[model samples]
Target: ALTNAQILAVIDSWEETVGQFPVITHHVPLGGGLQGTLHCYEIPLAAPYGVGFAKNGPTRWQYKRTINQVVHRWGSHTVPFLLEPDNINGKTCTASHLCHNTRCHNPLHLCWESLDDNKGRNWCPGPNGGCVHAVVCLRQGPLYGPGATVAGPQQRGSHFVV
Candidate 1:
């Protein structure tokens, strides 16, 4: 149970040291003539938990823990938690990647889902000839609109603007 201040501090430190979140747009075919654009955070692959830097002592950072977890923690405060009510209650929820890219940290591409439901997604062929699931999200960007505030380094500008 990490506090919002702690989560924001980490995100702010990350932006200060590692640089801005490298968000990229990806267009995917969702089948049935449906097309979707996914905002992705381009970063190196990290183990489920590894070693990295943090604000306080030599604590492991997102690279040490996981990016999606941190992003979800912050998202829960800023954006609506989009997980189904059933999945949120009475079950263990995991941050499932809708884009099927573990390296992506885009909040829009992630949702809290039951471990079972998340694992039940089927793999299908993608436009790039790579195997991927056709999952899609109704919400798009501008997650931080008016009246929303994000935590980050005070010396530097905010990171998650739009």
Candidate 2:
């Protein structure tokens, strides 16, 4: 498995080499309708730490990897950057609030799922989600619902979260 240091290195390299994402010292305020420092939550470039989002007040929405468009594809040497989960145990299959914004990793925001609630009708997808079945959660971003069947084999419900 990849370490936090390794993950941070990838993000740093991406920031320097990749041209897709923007570098924002301040959070973008995507307006999930929560209060935060409204800034502080970041797509972690820090070692091993992928993300740490605030479910409340003054959230810092760093748009570091927002350039995930059709033309430019992002990649990873350390992070598990793929739409489908590629392991047996669910270790690499899941992530914290940490995200890797590149062209290739997520052609869509298909990697996230909500954890706050368990029932299907109880949640909703994150703003830029790729999974068809999306539900909001306190951890990560959304809870991928039954509608995300489009992901096929990458489905996490059948698999356990690491």
Candidate 3:
């Protein structure tokens, strides 16, 4: 909702003086005896929007205000453009099923589905797989229905974490 440009402006002002990035490391333990890998990187949500501020700086009030503006533009009167706890390494994974993008805390960016319910491809693809909530919320698959795991447009849905 923040028209992307407005959101970037907020970043430029608030992040300019800070470090270039916030590369939080996260280690995930896959379920059922599977070992997990770790991921570390700074947030790429910047630059693309040309906002201000750098990473790793003290928090500012204007940062909060601008984020609030982003929240409004996101079509929600409440809830900032962020999920609670932007950092997620070393914490319990609360997301429904792990798509392995551990730092993603965006709620809308996540689709709530049962492991059993998600049967596309050969595995349970995350919301970023382009499965509409109409599948879970409306109890249906993506309008394209089901397909091979690595096939077609369905494979490239963007998610923050994965």
Candidate 4:
């Protein structure tokens, strides 16, 4: 397992290097959403901006939409080599979100789920008001949803304030 410092170093390096590009940074937002900002790195880049290579070919995303994409493809030296989870409890296969944010790069936000028990829903919790879903959350903005309550003291007004 990677330590917090190691993970943070990777985060820092990414922001300074590959993540510095305008294309990647343009529509993509850092941290999580309503479910919780497990520090998810959300990417709202349209399909055109979404990068990906053949699953059986180059083994990489051509556009590299999210930071995790870049890390999973190439971050052995920068951070713990991250491999997309392929199995759930030694079962066939499953890819589920441990956190609500879709673009989160933090390994802490990803997990495998057993097919027997899985709910195909995306939502973030609310403190004293309404909630939001994926597409709506994405279109809204980075400072959307209950997750906005996190990240910083100044950004704590998460109920769709703007």
Candidate 5:
């Protein structure tokens, strides 16, 4: 487990190395025919435990090391490590994706919950009036251009290609 400072330091260093922490907004369709927006990392998770890194740069390996530290601190989920550092380690709770998009790193869309509770929210009505694992409708115009798709429940694993 990493201390809160260490975790934050890793994030800060990674952001500095990457030159940006871009958050893109996507117009998503929620349940009940409602429409909402989702905040996602412009650079999707490229490492285990939802860690992002510079795809190509002079300091790519250094960035990888930063991401590796984060992965080592939180094996299955990195959100809780950043959002709930005090209570995540050695606990049975899991990081729940409020927006239902596992690839989304938006702090506003993440929470720490019990495994049972997290499972219960799957495919259920979410706070945003969308299913926990609703298919993100990215057809609408995105603030950061096009071709971004949300990750489904089946792709909850740490490593994501997009």
Candidate 6:
């Protein structure tokens, strides 16, 4: 297993994202439909940890690293020193990234969500609910998921496109 310090060291080696956020990009099918063209952002895991996808730019590796470190250190206790920490009550909870970066672990970017909420939110629109993913899907035709249809400007959302 990799230590939190080790993870920081890895991020220290990568260039900063446009907004001065530190991120380490690794190309592996970690999860969330990631490919080489997309980077994991930081801290590549074997299976246990989830992967955050960055299409481009950077992820807040330092923030992400801290969360992992704290979580690892706590063992079973929930760390209250978070942005919006929730009630997991010692059970494993889904750390949903509000930024939608699968790899980002920053407390500000992360929220403790129930499995239902996590599965319901969208990174895509037509199905995901008006997120960037949805807008992109609307323009690209059929690249992300399914149930996309085009009728007219006003009626686009009415029918499913084939």
Candidate 1 residue-wise lDDT, 9-71, digit = tens: 655544443333466787766543456777776443343221242222232133323554653
In every candidate, how many clashes are there? 1, 32, 13, 10, 0, 7
TM-score of each prediction: 0.43, 0.22, 0.24, 0.29, 0.45, 0.30
39-147, model 3: which lDDT tens digit per residue?
A: 3333355443223322333321112344554433221111233334423444432233133232332232244333344334224322344333453321122223355
Once fitted onto the true fold, the runs of candidate 6 whose alpha carbons sit more than 4 angstroms away are 1-41, 44-85, 88-93, 99-102, 122-144, 147-162
Residue-by-residue lDDT tens digits, candidate 4, 46-91: 4332233112233222221234334333321212223334455786
lDDT of each: 0.46, 0.32, 0.34, 0.36, 0.48, 0.37
Candidate number that wins on lDDT, 1 or 6: 1
RMSD, one per candidate, in order: 20.8, 16.3, 17.4, 15.6, 13.6, 13.3
lDDT score of model 2?
0.32
Q: Per TM-score, what order, best first?
A: 5, 1, 6, 4, 3, 2
Model 5 C-alpha lDDT per residue in residues 89-144, reported as the tens digit of each score: 45576666655564454444656656665555554543445433343222222221
What RMSD value applies to candidate 2? 16.3
TM-score of 6: 0.30
Give me the candidate number with maximum TM-score.
5
Off by more than 4 A, model 1: 1-19, 45-89, 123-162
Q: Compared with the true structure, what per-residue lDDT tens digits does model 2 show for residues 74-96?
A: 32322334334445344333332
lDDT of 6 by residue, 19-135 (tens): 233455533221244333222233333322332212232422222334445532321111222323444555446655444555544344344656554544442333223444321
TM-score of 4: 0.29
Q: Which candidate is the best by lDDT?
A: 5
TM-score preference between candidates 5 and 6, better one: 5
